[PDB]
Design a protein around this ligand. Structure first.
Ligand code: CL
Ligand code: MG
Ligand code: MG
Ligand code: MG
Ligand code: MG
Ligand code: MG
Ligand code: MG
Ligand code: MG
Lengths: 286, 287
């Protein structure tokens, strides 16, 4: 169905409605962390060093585009450890590269030691092991589920099964487990380590990403996108599905407000910051 | 509200319908691991040593009742490492004790080193770290959420929020992360480590546990039970809610059958075994 090849007809209204929802339920805007020139050079140098064994040359412009996710979606008022912050910048960037690679070019023997080097550089020993395991689990999951029947079943059955897959696959469990050292906040550290932090934020991250990455993904034959569960060529069907997804986001956001003040700031800054970054990034345009 | 204080009016019919569902959708019955008298004594001795610093005496009969969960809900055809199996017996048992304790008697300084000792006895070094971290995160979660407003929000809002809390709180993530060394199966190891294994099995474990532990939990003022989300004193409301939960179990089970054969056996033996153990255990027969 060529009518289902694009969500472009809904682009402007959906963007407006996402923003309206955030203004009504989160209110406080995300803020962009600013890196010094020295910090941004350090981050890019580490990204280039990590993907060089895989034969990939990545421009500064591409790295800076991927790093904007971290700059916009962390919680600047609560940052305590800028070394952990740089680590998340590097790890976020290089796993975008992995996510985009053909699996024939994936090489664990070459890439996993680079992830370990990044973690050992920026984290103390215990946190380094936690961040590295989460990175390893994510890149392994991305690899093993390429064209997988498990992925097919979880992504075609219901929203419940799909979001369950995405807790790992969209990277948010990884994100929380490498981000808690930024904040040094005992409650958030526990929610990161139980993955409750990831489970609370999966839908709000995923629904936004899926909307803006739909056209690209379906053009590439990728099935990991919740809007494939609906007939996007039927305007009534799309409207009902989109509203059900907005309701999921709102329910999660209202439950996130029961968490402690710092933790809920981190969770909400992540979901809203991802939206601000997604709508500004050429990755998601045509 | 006394009419909501019990699910006893539904006990026989719900038990029958759970079993019918398993016979239709899982088919293969769970089977019970048998421990030698020496193995069982080694497990119970480790349990006693681990909880002794907390001042608790626990009878053998009581340890045996908790260890039946592991004997019934692992996957005997796939067991390769019986030391890992004994570790799960011990860790399962002692965290029931933690789950039943008044939190004023929780002592992390005394208990966490005992959990570390168990993991170091039975697993290799990498696996021991994974099992200990999962056990530590579980007992920390149980403690910090006692009477917590986060718990109140997640357990009163919707089934979605509730089962999200239970991925950790029922202990299944912990179970998976201490059980993958039993099987030495690379795919299952990865689903355990991503917690996809736990997310796939949470509803089937939790709906069954919640039904049979409702009366006890309500009598103690505990709110972590999905049947509190429905008016159990209304037979029509209870029937609709129960059917919705059966449908959730079936959807999970049918999706589980897309995993590799060994992994799906482990997942399904866990869900069905938990039901067989729950319906035969005195823990769930009096409040
Ligand atoms: Cl670990
Ligand atoms: Mg991906
Ligand atoms: Mg992608
Ligand atoms: Mg996407
Ligand atoms: Mg409990
Ligand atoms: Mg309990
Ligand atoms: Mg219970
Ligand atoms: Mg009534």
């Amino acid at each position: 169905d060529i009518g289902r090849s694009s969500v472009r007809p809904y682009l402007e209204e959906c963007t407006r409605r996402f923003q309206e929802m955030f203004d009504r339920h989160v209110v406080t805007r995300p803020t962009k962390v600013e890196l010094t020139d020295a910090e941004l050079r350090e981050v890019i140098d580490d990204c280039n060093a990590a993907v060089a064994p895989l034969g990939k040359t990545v421009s500064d412009e591409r790295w800076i585009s991927y790093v904007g996710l971290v700059l916009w979606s962390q919680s600047p008022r609560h940052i305590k450890d800028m070394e952990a912050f740089k680590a998340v910048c590097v790890l976020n960037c290089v796993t975008f590269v992995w996510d985009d690679m053909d699996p024939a070019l994936h090489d664990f023997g070459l890439f996993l030691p680079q992830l370990r080097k990044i973690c050992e550089k920026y984290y103390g020993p215990e946190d380094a092991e936690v961040a590295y395991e989460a990175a390893r689990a994510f890149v392994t999951s991305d690899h093993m589920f390429r064209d997988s029947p498990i992925k097919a079943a979880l992504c075609t059955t219901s929203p419940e099964q799909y979001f369950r897959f995405r807790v790992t696959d969209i990277g948010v469990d990884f994100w929380m487990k490498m981000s808690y050292p930024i904040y040094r906040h005992p409650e958030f550290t526990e929610h990161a380590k139980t993955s409750l932090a990831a489970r609370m934020t999966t839908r709000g991250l995923t629904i936004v990403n899926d909307f803006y990455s739909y056209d690209r993904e379906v053009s590439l034959g990728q099935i990991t996108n919740c809007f494939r569960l609906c007939d996007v060529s039927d305007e009534t069907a799309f409207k009902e599905f989109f509203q059900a997804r907005l309701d999921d986001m709102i329910e999660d956001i209202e439950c996130i407000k029961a968490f402690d003040q710092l933790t809920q700031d981190v969770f909400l800054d992540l979901i809203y910051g991802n939206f601000v970054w997604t709508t500004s990034n050429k990755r998601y345009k045509t």
